[PDB]
Short mmCIF file of the C-alpha atoms (twelve columns), coordinates in Angstrom:
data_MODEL
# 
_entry.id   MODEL 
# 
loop_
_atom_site.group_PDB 
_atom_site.id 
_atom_site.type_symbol 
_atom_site.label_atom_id 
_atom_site.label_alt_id 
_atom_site.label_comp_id 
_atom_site.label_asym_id 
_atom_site.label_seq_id 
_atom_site.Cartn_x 
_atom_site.Cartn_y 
_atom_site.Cartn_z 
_atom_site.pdbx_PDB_model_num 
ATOM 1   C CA . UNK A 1   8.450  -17.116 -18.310 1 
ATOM 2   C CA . UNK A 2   9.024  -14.652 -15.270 1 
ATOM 3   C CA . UNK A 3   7.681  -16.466 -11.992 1 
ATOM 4   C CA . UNK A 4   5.244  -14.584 -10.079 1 
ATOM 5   C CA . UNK A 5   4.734  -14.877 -6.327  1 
ATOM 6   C CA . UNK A 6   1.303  -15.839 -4.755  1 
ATOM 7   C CA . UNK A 7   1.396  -15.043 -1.169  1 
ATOM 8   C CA . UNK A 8   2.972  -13.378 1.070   1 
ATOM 9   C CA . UNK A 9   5.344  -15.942 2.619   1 
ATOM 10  C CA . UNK A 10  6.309  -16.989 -1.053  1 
ATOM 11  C CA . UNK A 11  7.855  -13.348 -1.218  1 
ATOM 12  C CA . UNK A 12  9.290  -13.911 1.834   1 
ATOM 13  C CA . UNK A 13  11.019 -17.124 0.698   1 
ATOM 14  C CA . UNK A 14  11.908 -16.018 -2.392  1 
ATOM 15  C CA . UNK A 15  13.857 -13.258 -0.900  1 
ATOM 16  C CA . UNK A 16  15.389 -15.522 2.231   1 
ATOM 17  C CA . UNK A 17  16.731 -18.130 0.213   1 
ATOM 18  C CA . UNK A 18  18.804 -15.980 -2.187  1 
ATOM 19  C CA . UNK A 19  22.233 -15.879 -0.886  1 
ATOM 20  C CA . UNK A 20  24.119 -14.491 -4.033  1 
ATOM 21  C CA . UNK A 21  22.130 -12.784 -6.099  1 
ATOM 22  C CA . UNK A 22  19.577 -9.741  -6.118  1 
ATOM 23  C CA . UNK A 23  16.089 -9.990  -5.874  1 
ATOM 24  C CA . UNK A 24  14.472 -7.650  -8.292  1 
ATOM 25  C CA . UNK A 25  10.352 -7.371  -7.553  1 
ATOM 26  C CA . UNK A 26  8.173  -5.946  -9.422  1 
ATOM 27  C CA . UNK A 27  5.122  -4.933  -7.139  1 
ATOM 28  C CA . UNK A 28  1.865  -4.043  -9.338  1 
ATOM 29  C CA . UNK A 29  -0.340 -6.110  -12.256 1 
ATOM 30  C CA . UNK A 30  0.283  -8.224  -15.149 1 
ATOM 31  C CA . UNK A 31  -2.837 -5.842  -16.621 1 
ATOM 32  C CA . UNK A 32  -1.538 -2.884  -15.580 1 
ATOM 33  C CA . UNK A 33  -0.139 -0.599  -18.706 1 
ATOM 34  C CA . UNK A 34  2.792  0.266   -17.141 1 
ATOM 35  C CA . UNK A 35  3.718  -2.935  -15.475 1 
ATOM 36  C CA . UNK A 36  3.204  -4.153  -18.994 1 
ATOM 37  C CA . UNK A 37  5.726  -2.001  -20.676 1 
ATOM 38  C CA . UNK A 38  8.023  -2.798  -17.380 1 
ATOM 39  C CA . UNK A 39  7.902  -6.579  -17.768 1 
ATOM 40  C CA . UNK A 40  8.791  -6.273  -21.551 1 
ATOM 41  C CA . UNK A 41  12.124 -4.658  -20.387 1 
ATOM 42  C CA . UNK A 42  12.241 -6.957  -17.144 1 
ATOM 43  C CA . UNK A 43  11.310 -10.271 -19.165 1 
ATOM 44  C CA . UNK A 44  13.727 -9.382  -22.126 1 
ATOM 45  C CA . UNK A 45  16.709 -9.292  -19.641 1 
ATOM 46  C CA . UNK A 46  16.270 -11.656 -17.055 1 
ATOM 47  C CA . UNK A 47  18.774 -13.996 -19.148 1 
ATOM 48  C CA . UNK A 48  21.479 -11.159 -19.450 1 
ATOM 49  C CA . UNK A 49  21.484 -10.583 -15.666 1 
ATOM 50  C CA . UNK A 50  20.908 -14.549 -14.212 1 
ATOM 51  C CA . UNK A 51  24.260 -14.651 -12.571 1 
ATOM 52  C CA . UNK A 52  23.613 -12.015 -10.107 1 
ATOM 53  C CA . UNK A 53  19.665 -11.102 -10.498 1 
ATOM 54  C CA . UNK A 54  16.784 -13.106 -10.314 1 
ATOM 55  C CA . UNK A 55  13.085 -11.307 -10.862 1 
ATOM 56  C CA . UNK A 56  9.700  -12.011 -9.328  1 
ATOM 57  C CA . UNK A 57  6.186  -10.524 -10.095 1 
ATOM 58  C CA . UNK A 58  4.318  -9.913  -7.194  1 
ATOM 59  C CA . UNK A 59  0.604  -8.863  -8.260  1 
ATOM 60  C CA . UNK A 60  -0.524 -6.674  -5.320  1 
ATOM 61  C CA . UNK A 61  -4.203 -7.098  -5.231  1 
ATOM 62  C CA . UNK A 62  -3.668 -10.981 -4.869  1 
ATOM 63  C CA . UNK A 63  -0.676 -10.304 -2.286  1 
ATOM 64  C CA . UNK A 64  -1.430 -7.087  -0.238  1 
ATOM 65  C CA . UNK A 65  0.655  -7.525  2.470   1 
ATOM 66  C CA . UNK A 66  3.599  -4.912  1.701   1 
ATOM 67  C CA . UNK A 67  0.998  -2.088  -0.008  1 
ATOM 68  C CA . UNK A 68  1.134  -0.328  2.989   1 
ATOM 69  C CA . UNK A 69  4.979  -0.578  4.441   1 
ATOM 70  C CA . UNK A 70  6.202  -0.138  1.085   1 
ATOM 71  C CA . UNK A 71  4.039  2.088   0.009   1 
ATOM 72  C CA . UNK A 72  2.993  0.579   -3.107  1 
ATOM 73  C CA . UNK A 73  0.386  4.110   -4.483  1 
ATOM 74  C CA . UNK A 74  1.961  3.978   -7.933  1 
ATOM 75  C CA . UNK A 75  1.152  1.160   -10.210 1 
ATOM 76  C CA . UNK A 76  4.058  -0.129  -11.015 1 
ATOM 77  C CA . UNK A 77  6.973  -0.677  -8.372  1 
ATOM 78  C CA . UNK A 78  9.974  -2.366  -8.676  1 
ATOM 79  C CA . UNK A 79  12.617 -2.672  -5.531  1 
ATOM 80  C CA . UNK A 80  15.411 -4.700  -4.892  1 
ATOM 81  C CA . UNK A 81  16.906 -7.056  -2.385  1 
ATOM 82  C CA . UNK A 82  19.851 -8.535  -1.403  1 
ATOM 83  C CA . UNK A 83  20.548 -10.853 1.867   1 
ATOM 84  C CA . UNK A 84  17.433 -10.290 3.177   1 
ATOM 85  C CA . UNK A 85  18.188 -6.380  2.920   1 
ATOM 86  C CA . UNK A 86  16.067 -3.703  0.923   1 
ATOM 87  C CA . UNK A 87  18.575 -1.680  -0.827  1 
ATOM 88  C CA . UNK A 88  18.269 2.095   -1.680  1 
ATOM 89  C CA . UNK A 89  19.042 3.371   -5.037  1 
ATOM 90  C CA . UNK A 90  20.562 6.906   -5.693  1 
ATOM 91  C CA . UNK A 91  20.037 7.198   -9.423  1 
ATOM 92  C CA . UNK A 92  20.024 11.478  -9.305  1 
ATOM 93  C CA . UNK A 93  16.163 11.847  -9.547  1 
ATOM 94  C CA . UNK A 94  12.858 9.809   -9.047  1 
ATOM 95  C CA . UNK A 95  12.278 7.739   -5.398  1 
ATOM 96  C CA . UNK A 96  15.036 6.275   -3.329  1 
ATOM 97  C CA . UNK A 97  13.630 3.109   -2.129  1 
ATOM 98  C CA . UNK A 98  11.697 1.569   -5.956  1 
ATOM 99  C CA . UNK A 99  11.537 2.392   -9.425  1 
ATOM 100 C CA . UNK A 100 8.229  3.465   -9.822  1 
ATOM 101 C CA . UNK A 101 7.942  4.360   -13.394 1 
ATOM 102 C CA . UNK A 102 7.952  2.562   -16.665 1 
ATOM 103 C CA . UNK A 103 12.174 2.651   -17.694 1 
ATOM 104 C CA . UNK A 104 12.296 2.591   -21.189 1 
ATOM 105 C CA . UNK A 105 16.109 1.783   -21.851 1 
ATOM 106 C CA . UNK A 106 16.624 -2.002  -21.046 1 
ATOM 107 C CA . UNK A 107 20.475 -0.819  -20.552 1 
ATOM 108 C CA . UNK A 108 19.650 1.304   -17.836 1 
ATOM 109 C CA . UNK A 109 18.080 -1.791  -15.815 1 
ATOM 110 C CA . UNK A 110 20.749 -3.736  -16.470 1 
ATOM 111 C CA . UNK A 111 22.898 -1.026  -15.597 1 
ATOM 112 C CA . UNK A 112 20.584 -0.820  -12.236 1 
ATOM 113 C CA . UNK A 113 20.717 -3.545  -11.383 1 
ATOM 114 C CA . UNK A 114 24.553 -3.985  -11.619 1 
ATOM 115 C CA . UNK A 115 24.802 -1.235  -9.144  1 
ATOM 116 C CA . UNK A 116 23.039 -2.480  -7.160  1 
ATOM 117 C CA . UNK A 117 24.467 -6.287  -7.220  1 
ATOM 118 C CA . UNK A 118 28.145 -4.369  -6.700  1 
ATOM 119 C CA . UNK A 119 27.254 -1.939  -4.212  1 
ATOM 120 C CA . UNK A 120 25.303 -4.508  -1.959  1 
ATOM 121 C CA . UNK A 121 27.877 -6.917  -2.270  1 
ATOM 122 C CA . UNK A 122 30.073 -4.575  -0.469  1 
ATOM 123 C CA . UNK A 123 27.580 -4.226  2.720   1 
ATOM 124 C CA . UNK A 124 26.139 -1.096  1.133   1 
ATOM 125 C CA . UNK A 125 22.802 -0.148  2.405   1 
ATOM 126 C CA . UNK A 126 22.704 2.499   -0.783  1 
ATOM 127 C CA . UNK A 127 24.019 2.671   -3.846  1 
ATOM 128 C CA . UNK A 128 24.640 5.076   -6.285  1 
ATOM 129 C CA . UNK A 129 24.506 4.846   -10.003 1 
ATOM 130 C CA . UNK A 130 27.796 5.669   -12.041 1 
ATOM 131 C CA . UNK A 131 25.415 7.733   -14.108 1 
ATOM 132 C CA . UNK A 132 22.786 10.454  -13.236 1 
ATOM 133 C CA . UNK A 133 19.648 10.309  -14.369 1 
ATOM 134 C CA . UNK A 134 11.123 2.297   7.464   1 
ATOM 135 C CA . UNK A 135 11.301 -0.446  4.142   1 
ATOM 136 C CA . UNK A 136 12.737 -3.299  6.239   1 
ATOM 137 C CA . UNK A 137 12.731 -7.048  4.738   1 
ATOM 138 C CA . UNK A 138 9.616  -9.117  4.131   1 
ATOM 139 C CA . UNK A 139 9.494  -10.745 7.129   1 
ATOM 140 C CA . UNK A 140 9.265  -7.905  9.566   1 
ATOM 141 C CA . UNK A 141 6.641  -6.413  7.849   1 
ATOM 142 C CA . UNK A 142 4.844  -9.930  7.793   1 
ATOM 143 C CA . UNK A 143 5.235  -10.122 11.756  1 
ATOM 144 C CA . UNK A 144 3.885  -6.245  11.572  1 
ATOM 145 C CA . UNK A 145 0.951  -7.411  10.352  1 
ATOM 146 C CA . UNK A 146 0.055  -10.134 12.620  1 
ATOM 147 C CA . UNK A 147 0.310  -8.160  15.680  1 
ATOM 148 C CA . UNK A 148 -2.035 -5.181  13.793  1 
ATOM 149 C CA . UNK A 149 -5.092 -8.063  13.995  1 
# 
């Protein structure tokens, strides 16, 4: 059910043409363990969070071209967009540009995700969770990588 991205200028589009709602990514495998355990909670609210939210799997051995500017190392990532912006997180511990461990609570993503939908909405480049617990959009870092080769 959750659509998954093929290239690189799908990702791109995808996160272009979305004028009023988040895009949630989640950079890693559909065989990976925990991007397994992450799509459960990802897949199992995707209706709950449609009116501001919509989620994209992005496997990153088929679609490579953001490993390196977003430093995808950990097997599961999961970062979020809005307007064409990345958007930081401040949730009190763990990175501030992904989520880049398995998140057991499906509240908390929703919750997440919220925050983020609220906070970005309001020109925020960060936001920061009620509760405690370089990067720039797709495009650049596609135009990045043509003038590398």
């Amino acid at each position: 059910m959750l659509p998954h991205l093929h290239n690189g200028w799908q990702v791109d589009q995808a996160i272009l043409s979305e004028e009023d709602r988040v895009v949630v990514i989640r950079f890693g495998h559909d065989w990976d363990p925990t991007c397994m355990k992450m799509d459960e909670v990802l897949y199992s609210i995707a209706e709950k969070v449609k009116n501001f939210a919509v989620i994209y799997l992005v496997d990153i051995t088929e679609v490579p071209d953001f490993n390196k500017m977003y430093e995808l190392y950990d097997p599961c990532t999961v970062m979020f967009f809005f307007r064409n912006k990345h958007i930081m997180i401040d949730l009190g511990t763990g990175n501030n540009n992904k989520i880049n461990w398995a998140m057991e609570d499906k509240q908390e993503m929703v919750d997440i995700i919220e925050t983020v939908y609220r906070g970005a909405r309001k020109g925020r480049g960060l936001v920061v969770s009620p509760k405690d617990y370089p990067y720039p959009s797709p495009g650049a870092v596609l135009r990045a990588n043509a003038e590398a080769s």
